[PDB]
Amino acid sequence: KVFGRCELAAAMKRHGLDNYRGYSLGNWVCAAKFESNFNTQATNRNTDGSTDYGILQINSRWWCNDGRTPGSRNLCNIPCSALLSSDITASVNCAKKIVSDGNGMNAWVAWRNRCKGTDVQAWIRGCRL
Template identity: 50%
Template sequence: MRSLLVLLLVAAASAKVFERCEWARKLKASGMDGYYGVSLADWVCLTRWESNYNTMAKNYNTDGSTDFGIFQINSYWWCNDYIINSHNACGINCSVLLSDDVTAAINCAKRVVRDPQGISTDCAPRAGLISRGRDLSSYLDGCGV
């Protein structure tokens, strides 16, 4: 039991809250700038308001689903949390979205945006964040990206 507690504490310690520019550079290096028409500033804005750049962010929804990680990826559509019946379109366990290694989260966000309904399937309409022509350049100010 004691070793389980230590492992849980280590897992929690591996969470990361990115700084804005650090996150912008990570997204750019991962090919997110302009991916399926979503600008780098849109991604930075989206993740700022959805998770405050926190890889361990979780939001429990009234429909029984949960939003996971830095992108707040929903368990009903995109990952399997083994609590609700999931479509699991990203083919992953939701727990991998709660890691400082954001590879799975970025890959799943790319899958979300490729969906016929695009990112609107997930959180954008609720948060009202995808720019739709608004100037979001301030999210990249001073980042050198």
């Protein structure tokens, strides 16, 4: 599923991401835009052998199990393929764990390099939320 911008904003807000760990909704929408282009099916391999999965590009070295990432944790206790569903529930629940783990949203490289410090409220412009 390729979410619309406001469509994703509303789903993220319903699941309690708006202001989760102090990160406003626009931060999460911006992160998803630059991580996955709003595409729940997005997958990208990393140089360390791990892969990033789904709308928020959750990594198989720490957070989900894909069976092919040696010496990896599965801290969200979920198969990585479950993070590709059109329903974002599993990605959101896992993202809540990630953002609580110490570094905040700096866990998302695209957030750090493209959203952090910018006018993220623009990502929810026009949305009825």
